């Protein structure tokens, strides 16, 4: 995944087989280091 | 805070040729699907053209209303888009907004991609 | 073509309360509504995408819930900054078609 922080994201293709792609919007995930962005909403997310 | 300036409007001999443009700045723009957008008096909004980027071939779908009239030639160059408009109508008038279209699903290589940003909007007076 | 429906086109009230509204499609579009926001004399703005995904800048008592010709536009809360013209989008196939509007207004 790509997180952007308070930000957007724009998808790409990749002409692979059955090639899905979608942005989110309202992420606040963890890693073992606490969270990775800071503001609430206006986080993205990318799942290919 | 992507920047969009519509510029170019204005009033016209009808039935002829007229120009609009659109320098932006606040993105990456050889990478970009843009669009354009008219709001008109009494109806609300036509969606005329989306370009493409250069790793699709610069192509413009276009609407119904405007084969062969409205042609949109960007260049990267100068980040600006363009819409040559040829033999105009008396409804083609109507209050422009050029757009950017941020690519949310790629479902089996063919993408969709809403209106993000908008311009300013500009007036075209097509009348006499 | 895919002749929308932006209905009601009059859906008035009160502060605190809660209101919705309809995008009603012909053919079977699967997720890819977008409702936006339009204002006086000024540009629109991008409100909601995907049906379910609420864009960043967006205040959340909006929030969005649909799919194939039916869907949804929940506001939970009516504060005061939401007297507009509301649309939607249809990006799935050529051309780009909108709803005429719903012009939610306050008194």
């Known amino acids: 995944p790509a997180i952007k922080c308070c930000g957007s994201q724009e998808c790409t293709p990749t002409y692979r087989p059955d090639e899905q792609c979608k942005v989110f919007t309202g992420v606040y995930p963890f890693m073992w280091g606490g969270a990775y962005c800071f503001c609430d909403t206006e986080n993205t997310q990318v799942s290919k | 805070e992507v920047q969009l300036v519509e510029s170019g409007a204005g009033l016209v001999q009808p039935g002829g040729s007229l120009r609009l443009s659109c320098a932006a700045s606040?993105?990456?723009?050889?990478?970009?699907?843009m669009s354009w957008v008219r709001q008109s008096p009494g109806k609300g909004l036509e969606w005329v053209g989306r370009?493409?980027?250069?790793?699709?071939?610069?192509?413009?779908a276009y609407a119904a209303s405007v084969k062969g009239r409205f042609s949109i030639s960007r260049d990267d160059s100068k980040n600006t888009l363009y819409l040559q408009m040829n033999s105009l109508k008396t409804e083609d008038t109507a209050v422009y907004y050029c757009?950017?279209?941020?690519?949310?699903?790629?479902?089996?290589?063919?993408?969709?991609?809403?209106?993000?940003?908008w311009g300013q909007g500009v007036l075209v007076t097509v009348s006499s | 073509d895919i002749q929308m429906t932006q209905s009601p086109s009059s859906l008035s009230a009160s502060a605190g309360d809660r209101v919705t509204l309809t995008c009603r499609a012909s053919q079977a579009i699967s997720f890819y509504l977008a409702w936006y926001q339009q204002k006086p004399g000024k540009a629109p703005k991008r409100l909601i995408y995907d049906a379910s995904e609420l864009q960043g800048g967006v205040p959340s008592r909006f929030s969005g819930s649909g799919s194939g010709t039916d869907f949804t536009l929940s506001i939970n809360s009516l504060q005061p900054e939401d007297s507009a013209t509301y649309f939607c989008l249809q990006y799935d196939s050529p051309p780009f078609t909108f709803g005429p509007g719903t012009k939610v207004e306050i008194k």
């Open positions: 757009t950017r279209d941020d690519r949310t699903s790629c479902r089996r290589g063919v993408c969709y991609a809403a209106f993000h940003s």
């Open positions: 370009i493409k980027g250069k790793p699709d071939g610069e192509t413009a």
């Open positions: 606040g993105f990456t723009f050889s990478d970009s699907w």
